[model samples]
Target: GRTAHNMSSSSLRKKSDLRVIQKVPYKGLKDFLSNLQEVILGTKLAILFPAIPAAIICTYCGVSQPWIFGLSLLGLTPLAERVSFLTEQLAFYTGPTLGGLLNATCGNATELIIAILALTNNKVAVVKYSLLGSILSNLLLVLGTSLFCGGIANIRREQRFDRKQADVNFFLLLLGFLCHLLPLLVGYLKNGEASAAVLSDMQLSISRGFSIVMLISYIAYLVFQLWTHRQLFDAQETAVISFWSGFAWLVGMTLVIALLSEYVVATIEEASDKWNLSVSFISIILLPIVGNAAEHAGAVIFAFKNKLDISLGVALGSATQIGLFVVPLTIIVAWILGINMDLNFGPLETGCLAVSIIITAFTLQDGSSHYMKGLVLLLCYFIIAICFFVDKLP
Candidate 1:
């Protein structure tokens, strides 16, 4: 049965293209546009239009540059949302295996680009902890909020998802974190230096080697999910768009992110210094939220709509993507760019990761959820946030 849908190298197909693009949940184009107009005006992505003009004007006139730079950062939100939207559209067109590839590859491109910028700047802590914060936030914050909303909205107090599937992700996620923690464990077993401290030659070497192995582990996961269990993961997944409108939004967003990435890169130091924040603090706490805000919001929205699987997948999968793909890619990118970054994070940060996996794994072991579970997840996230926000990772 799984083999029948195993179109990995066979004819490609999608679940979305079967319907007319014209057929939307809304009444029709005029009404849909009318409905969409509300969203357009309501969302932060809408701010990008104003942001673009404002950015040009501020840059040309030598006006409040940092303030303008921050606005430019705001502009990226809509772009990320757009890119995410396009990825959805493209995945719809490609279908199944190719669709999943697009989903994985295109989804996290922007954050990875931002990491590339940060790594080149030797702002290593932010890059590492950005992954840390992103994963933990997804596990606790995003998933917890999903459970809370999903539970509260449902007539019943609890919601159930696939235990087997959760097991797949749980173990894969566990494997990813384990690969990361092992090097740190060895590196710090006898060290006087702390996490985020300069890596010894042995420590650095171990990290470089482990990153490659981790990359391979991610590949194995793809094979398992996409090949071994295609039917379970791949299905008639629907996307919101089909064509040129999607392309236009994607292009526009790409341009906007390029411009704002420059702004954030140029202005990050001043922003941090002005706010008296460390780069690690900003990146861990702020950057990913903003970068992934579009999808982050979508996860919550799905939960409220009572689709807990998509909600969990959106949050947890994004976290896995960061571990399986983003971090490994960053390690390779840092090496390619001749920057010195490794897998070493602070003990506090590493411990948060461990707790994240432990609590969530046990909670999800049964593959079901409720509001109290969600509440406790948020509590864990909040506790971690308190320690992290106050920490000086220098």
Candidate 2:
């Protein structure tokens, strides 16, 4: 609530003027103490202080991969919070329509930045596994935990949500994943029949084709959800944010995230080698959770508030974005970057995806969830996790 001073306005009755409007902090600094208060007012500003250990331990000293992975994970905490804060501010300013669009796109920004860095480094396997990892984590881990917490803590009852839009999203997810598996299945078809060159050429062509088609489909999806059938994503949360301050935080945090991501990329190597950890294990499970877990919290927060539609949208929509958007977008970018990435992740990767999707479909069909429902999803996820853990990279 900014108020205008009347005495100054009356005194300057001729034209237009205002007395010294001194209420705003940081406006005319040192004007020093004023700006100091402004800076201190940002509650999130306190979080950056927590990042020093990660910077010092991961970036400066020995810079071990274990420390880098572990600490970068910690440092990312504040950044994600800040990003969410900024996104909510923008979303609230925009109010629901573009707001949901805004949140849908930017919700995954941190995860995307980390993956982009990995992709640029030519860490193809890491990127690919991370793609699947992100989907699985959203579908199973975030949703499961949130639902379980909501069901148990809030009431011994079932939570229901509007499933019309969610069902469509499930279909979209299924289609996108099927497209993802196309190249892998195609690769298998010509596995022994064609020469290595033939197989490579064919798979690459299929990958490119699939990536382009998938990209177009995702754009169409954004249009459909945000424009054509906007109601599907009702209550989506943004504004132009055109000016400097608006753009500043967005750009600044992105750069910080990018830099920290490089450190994360640096540490992946040593961590894998040191602990005999599989790259798949790290990328597929741990990496997804580390950078994006706060998002997982957002989902739970909504579910607990009984806004399960938004919660489901957060979880399922993220999975769909990865499948329909991020993966294909990454593939196209990789092509542009001269990095060779075919969609053939592996049989195990494909199986997990297929199984997880089927389970999710059933969960959504009911349009309601309980603690037991959440438990089932968690059990399924744990089964997969144990299998991956045992199949470690030696």
Candidate 3:
């Protein structure tokens, strides 16, 4: 044993000495390459690079709808991550104030784009399903995984997050939830008494009014998060490229994402038929997962590091933005385009959202999490996922 150990140690030392003698080949390129490499290959997500070519080829070559749909989403996963990377890089150069604004707009750029595309196609239901799914995805799917994984990893320590942060999100979400509920109530109260078209118009007006309010509230939220309470979210890095280089990368990526999203939108119906899944499932379950890949990964990663504050921030912060910012922004945009998008997500969908938000509130009420708490959240998400899959919605 002693002799074998000494031989192995000698071999390792010889390899190290050889490496030292070989010298660095890319001395001048090292700094530049290192930063560029980090931007491109920063995370395990780089494994999906091949999917981009596959997606573009499938898109142009007239491949099967499901293949186009699936490949485009796979392609989008990394692009979504890259968007955040470029935004962060730009933030490094732009300063935190404008950086925060950049993040505010680009945080869910993919989702917003897809929603707009769907709205233009006049598939209002698709618009609703996708945006509503984004909110649910961040709230239950991402947040659950973060807490559950973080809880199990830190089994010896109690996991806790800032109650103040959670409290503010809760209030904002509750306000948004009320806004959604009131429109539904209007429809309910006037159901039989009003003409169908009249009722629709009334609901549309109410939704637009509420949407304006939601947008204003979201602006206020940006102020609170980035200005008055900026200290709470102080958060990183040297630019791999210059400001304009990164900005150009961001614009180019966004255009690529838009191209891929157009395909995703066009293919949703046919893809649903081909996969034997309902459009609702694809929109609510599948689409949101792809759009949310970046935020979900960040939340889960922060949780693993025992930084529950950041994990919760990623999850809750994204959820709040989608609910208040993205959804209303879509409605207002639709109004301009003369599309009648509204906040009435139907009784069942709204009920599920209310339950999810309430469950999240209860879980974080004590500002603590255990594996069991995480388990419950994950199970809640599971039940909701299955609900969407099993029950087809019109």
Candidate 4:
């Protein structure tokens, strides 16, 4: 009787298990795969996805430096966009404030990762060049092309953005410029025969101090943008994936990007030598071009659609983030790491930065855009490109 009863209970458990399996089935695999495909291949830029694996294989296969560098760069192009995509997914669940804040931080993830890698290698100049390049690229190249394309596409209509938004970004950018300027300016102090090393020490000290202040201001900017004046910059899209899925993808992609970033940094100098390009140009121009590719593309696409506000937000918002946030964040990180990174980007680089900010300020002062205005901005970018092309690294 006991054996029969045990047998009946075992059979009943198995029957219930079968029913549970039947109820749920195995639908997740197909849906999961489709989601993966959509996430990976959803954008036109997905063509570059192959480069990621190629980069990985190249790194381990003893391939040449240029191939490794180029492949890693192409690999990172799409990853940046995907990072932003995943962040937006998580944002959908977190509400606008946290989502916007996440967007602001992760939007610059590519630059931040590369900068930190360069910093770890004690290549502070590369850090400065790449960060400065990003600021310039966003403000001039990205914004200019968007405006130009938008202007031409909507020639019959006036191209305008929210100047209030533009005003806040420009003011922050100017403040950022002042932060860089004061450090650079201190080098010219002619009091009591101040020695070069002493001035250098002073600049580094001031840079670290200013970095903390800039960070504080950036936090405040987040509050202002996310909490107080969020309506001014308010924009949200429907979520595509669940929060945990987005989080998992974000982590995986970031890990992959970080792996690829180290490869890029390791091979940058070798690639530069092979291509006969200066390291400065490679850092200041090429890297940012690839890194900002997605943002640049999105901004121009919106501009073509005549949504100038979105375009401006993409361009100016990114520039403001880098100038006010990432730049200083790097300095403070370096400080903690015992690296001597600073805000003093030298006169020539700082001059270019200042002029870029000033001209952009002038351009947006009117809150309207035309092909000619964009043309001027584009020309300014070209001049800067030429400037770096001829300028060699020390």
Candidate 5:
């Protein structure tokens, strides 16, 4: 056997020779091309990773029913800015509403897909759970992540807020919340029965009507924004990225996200069943966390880049969208599709919604955010989560 010292010396020499050989090979053009390919491949994967789950969830949910394809289309809303540079022109007047609708529609894309899957299995309760979950998740989980990430960065830096904008948003949120609360209150006051026969449908008819109304509202808002903020759109500024290119990127990523959402839905249902958790719990808690991951990341990063107006716009705007556009639209669409989707909120869910609105309103009042405020919002989310887990209806 070789002595220890001799063996060590031989190992060192071998390693040194290997390094020299490796460097020589990498110095060649072929090596450079190979490395470039690897870099490209890695970048592609990085882009796809966030969206894969969303696609999977959509696919899994849509496996038995193909009509859910429309919902998958809806999931592309968050990236709408990329699709149309004209979107910026609409951002001020009705941009938030449209963005909100898209955000809610697409953000909950997986839920709609999963609902189709659940419907195929005749799991009505699961579908309902998914709806509730998506709502809560958007309000709590998605918002929380945005605030947390945005807050952390803000602590290191700072962002500006416009009081007028905040006031406008707060009023919009309040109006939307009241709109949502109306049916709930009416239903409850009437001993949990809808005030009118039409209201009592609780199927796809309501969802369809709501969707139509919201779509129209969004369009109107956009027109108004364009008229008022014409200057913002007309400003002479060169985009860092081309509109068409950004649109392409947005569409491509959205498709991937929609496909992945199918798998996520199935997995979530499986996990929920295995864990003996309620569908509502999974929807309100887990699904939102997964679905809005990219949106949350974007909001935070954008806030860091000092686009606080856009960032805050996204946060409050999304909440408004869910309340005004998505929820109502879903009710209408579901109704049109013959699904009995009551637009009323349950007591527990209503409580959650109320708190969400109130907290967001307060936090946004000054048009700025501090870490403490973020913490408060996060705490509210946790409280809502706890209520869901405990099955506290009120």
Candidate 6:
């Protein structure tokens, strides 16, 4: 009787287990994907708040006055930077691999938005400058500031750049440069109308093709990272916030940002008219600084927190995104809108950008920073500012 009772109990337990399994039905895959989307959306939403506000402010302050929408957009720099920082924080605990890609992608959303806006306005130069500004700002301003702050806080602390990572970054940078240069070479060979305001259909086609290739490359990079780092992702659980909550924030922020950006363009135009500032001066200098404020803040904070690797990662990663993704994507979008943009870099701007990238690369190569190096970076930025002012002088 006792043996019979024990067998009966065991059978009941098995039946209960099967029922539980049937009810749950292995929903882990669905849950995982949904959470990932939620996280990305949440980050995008958070960034939109400041970005939009800054954009609107610039419009009223700069855009309407001078009618230089390009210059006005410069005001979004601080907002862009902040978005980068916030996204960085949100992504950090998510998983470094996923965090890195997201940080890169979301960090450039403002520029992406501006590019689309330019498409409608037939402002190809604005689009090109936005792309240029995005890359330069990330490599020089974002990275430089982070290193400066991190170095100041941890003087004599020796950090190291991962050789593998550095190699990848350098390779991608080279590719980006080539993409920019290639079109110019082709244009030169074609002996196209140098003074023409818009790009030829052939030129636009080339730009679109390159952009597609780069976009695919970035997508591949994301896929490879996920495949290789599956183990890292496995250890983390879904965020405390529900998926819908994050999505709501994401959509809301994006809308707010779009509204604000329109204002920012208007303000910049106003300011340019009032101050008589050149569009080139504003686009090359002012806009980038403003859009990058948040990113700069986070980099500084991360450095103070002794997370130098993450900070540098944010900086360099941003630069890479701008070069490899933002610029290319913008060109394609502009092309679609029938706007012709030249990818050629002006001599002075190119020199400044190249110097900034090299100085930053050197400063962060050791994975450590000094106050002097910070000063140097800041000084370089100041010089660039001075150049803008000088260029504006009659």
TM-score of 3: 0.88
| Cα lDDT tens digits for candidate 6, 261-319 | 66544454456667777666766666666556555555666567665555655566567
Tell me how far candidate 2 lies from the true structure as C-alpha RMSD in angstroms.
8.6
Tens-digit lDDT track of model 3 for 13-95: 11112223223654555555544555565556778878888888876787788888888888898888777666666666777
In TM-score terms, candidate 6 sits at: 0.69
**Candidate 5 similarity to native, TM-score:** 0.62
Q: Which tens-of-lDDT digit does each residue in 95-187 have in candidate 4?
A: 666666667776788998999998999888889889999989988898889888888889998777778866888778877888988988888
For model 5, the stretches where C-alpha displacement exceeds 4 angstroms are 1-159, 189-215, 230-260, 263-270, 305-307, 392-394
CA-lDDT, candidates in order? 0.68, 0.69, 0.77, 0.78, 0.50, 0.56
TM-score of 1: 0.81
Q: Which stretches of candidate 6 lie above 4 Å from their native place?
A: 1-104, 185-205, 229-241, 366-368
lDDT of 5 by residue, 1-394 (tens): 1111111111111111234534565655644444323222322113433343454465656553233322333443332222222233223334444543333345434444455655544455656555555555555555566666677776767656666643554665565555556666545445554466644654324434455665566556545444564343222121233345444455564455445455444455455555667657766576554444444555565555555555454555455555565555555545556666565656776677777777666676666666676666678778877777878332
Strongest candidate by TM-score: 4
Please write out the lDDT profile of model 2 over residues 1-394, one tens digit for every residue.
1001100011111221122454543365434443323222344335444664557554666655576677677777666666665655554456555666666567677778877888888787778888888888988898898888888876855578877777777777777777767777666666466876777777787788887887777777777776676654544332223334555676777787787888778778788888887877888878787655555766776667766876776677777777877778787888888887888888888899899989988887867777888888888889888878878755
Q: Pick the candidate with the highest lDDT.
A: 4
TM-score of the candidate numbered 2? 0.83
Give the range where candidate 4 is weakest over 10 consecutive residues by summed lDDT. 3-12
List model 1 lDDT by residue over 94-209, tens digit each: 65677676676666766877777777777786577777777887888878887887778884655667666557777778777776676677665555654545445666777778
In model 4, the clashing pairs are none
Clashes of 4: 0
Candidate 2, position 128, lDDT: 82
